[PDB]
Subunit: 62 residues, 6 copies
């Protein structure tokens, strides 16, 4: 909410590359294209919709 | 009511884009989005199956 | 679509029509039977016995017939 | 600059950031909404509905915020 | 690749010359050329707006 | 192409005054300073760049 939205918003605006670790161990990398309450759209060579319930952590590269 | 998910899935449905749905358990389903609501997605391939969103990790369209 | 507008009519059709289904759980177990009843959170699945399945444990429901 | 090096990143930034824009048409009509998507020739503009606007009909795009 | 337009606009941009952009519909915009590409000009005044070249009739710099 | 370029080139070289009528009805007058594929630079009391897509006709004075 008061932390999650502004944090992702600044990453999207600044085009900061991120790593998204899923609860199952898979690591995704890309730019945050957009997001809403339940999903984050991540763009690398492809554009994919990631459900937040499957994410463990989002780690910015810088 | 803010949604990115709703119009993104609706576009995929309307334009009948093939997608891959990766489940949290690592299983990959493929097909077209026939319909969806708040909690489920109806995926159509050789058969029509209902997938619970809570079981989904990622949806990858074969074109955006 | 919005809300339960897909899940409820889809499960209700299977229930009324007694279509055999396979219910795949997130852990990979496959359950089979007919949908006897359901509510917001559970599905009652009838095979040799009637068992209550929590929807949160389900990944996919695959009907044996369209 | 050359090619689409200005138009594409500028529209993409507005799209990703869901910045409300005004789109002034060559005939003087003002359209408003958020850029949902765009390609070479059209912009999909979302307000109460999603409408496809041909770029050839547009004179200026004015963002509501920088 | 022959261009008069590219270096002329680039000079105006680099030297931050105020220009008037007259549109084909008779509307006059004013500001400085912030940037441009093949099809658009970004004009800066109180706000920064993208103008499509196809809508422009003439660009008049307040000095050449 | 084979007509437009040599015609404008001779007007520029000979310093022939021209009238440029725009599709919207406005008449501009001056000397052709230069031109390329998409624009003509017209000089009178000011130097202005005119997009060819906005021009209907170019009429030489002599």
């Amino acid at each position: 909410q008061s932390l999650q939205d502004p944090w992702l918003n600044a990453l999207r605006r600044e085009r900061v590359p991120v790593s998204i670790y899923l609860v199952n161990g898979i690591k995704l990398q890309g730019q945050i294209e957009s997001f809403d309450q339940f999903v984050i759209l991540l763009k690398n060579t492809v554009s994919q919709m990631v459900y937040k319930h499957a994410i463990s952590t989002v780690v910015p590269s810088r």
